[PDB]
Amino acid sequence: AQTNIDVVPFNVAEGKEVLLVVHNESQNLYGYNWYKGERVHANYRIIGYVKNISQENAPGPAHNGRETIYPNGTLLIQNVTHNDAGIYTLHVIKENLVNEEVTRQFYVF
Amino acid sequence: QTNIDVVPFNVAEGKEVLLVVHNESQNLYGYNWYKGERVHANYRIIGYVKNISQENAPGPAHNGRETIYPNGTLLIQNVTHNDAGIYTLHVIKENLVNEEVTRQFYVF
Ligand SMILES: [Cl-]
């Protein structure tokens, strides 16, 4: 994958904010979706973003209400809870549909 | 909401199979097929991009025998025993509220 993701901090205090920072400079991106877990599947979708409209899409079944997605794909989670800990998967949707999946994790203390 | 008919479900080696896609949606961006149960780049066969009316580049799971049509239908010719198994379609919507559909066929 071309996309890099840097989750900061890796261990987050309860009540604090976590960023899953996405670095992909490509000029041919269509958009993004984030999932909770290792799998790209609708049942685990959190939130996504469509670049040409500059808009978030509908919240997915896995959304906690505290996420914000940014136009470069980065995910913010505010006021983290213990249940937010675990595995996160970004699907980068390219205009040519040659897509990529990148999985990271963070934990909460 | 996406239906897929496997035609036929039990396939003779060396014959052809269709994964026939029925989806009436008017906000489709395109499609990708994968070998296996999961949407993952390492298993991608091929896709189709609607706004340019073209197949995209073959993926790692492409064997040179697979054709994708504009509605997402997949044709596999000259089927081998290795082609048998689980296939997953990822239906990409303009709003990125996407859908994953899995089917299977057997080879004899
Ligand atoms: Cl998890």
Side-chain angles (χ1 to χ4, degrees), chain A residues 42-66:
Chain A
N43 297 356
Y44 307 117
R45 204 174 68 79
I46 295 168
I47 192 64
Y49 188 93
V50 184
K51 289 173 76 85
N52 61 18
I53 298 179
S54 299
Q55 279 188 21
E56 294 194 321
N57 61 12
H63 89 294
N64 59 30
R66 292 173 283 96

Side-chain angles (χ1 to χ4, degrees), chain A residues 36-37 85-87:
Chain A
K36 186 75 187 291
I87 308 164

Side-chain angles (χ1 to χ4, degrees), chain A residues 30-33 39-42 45 49-50 57 91 93-99 101, chain B residues 29-32 37-41 44 48-49 56 90 92 94-98 100:
Chain A
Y30 185 80
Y32 314 92
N33 276 311
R39 300 218 318 107
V40 177
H41 190 283
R45 204 174 68 79
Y49 188 93
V50 184
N57 61 12
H91 203 201
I93 297 95
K94 304 230 281 287
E95 291 174 339
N96 66 353
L97 289 180
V98 180
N99 303 328
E101 307 74 39
Chain B
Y29 186 88
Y31 311 93
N32 279 302
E37 292 187 272
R38 288 186 295 100
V39 172
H40 193 275
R44 193 176 71 84
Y48 188 91
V49 184
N56 68 11
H90 200 198
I92 296 113
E94 284 167 357
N95 68 351
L96 298 180
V97 186
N98 299 333
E100 299 77 38

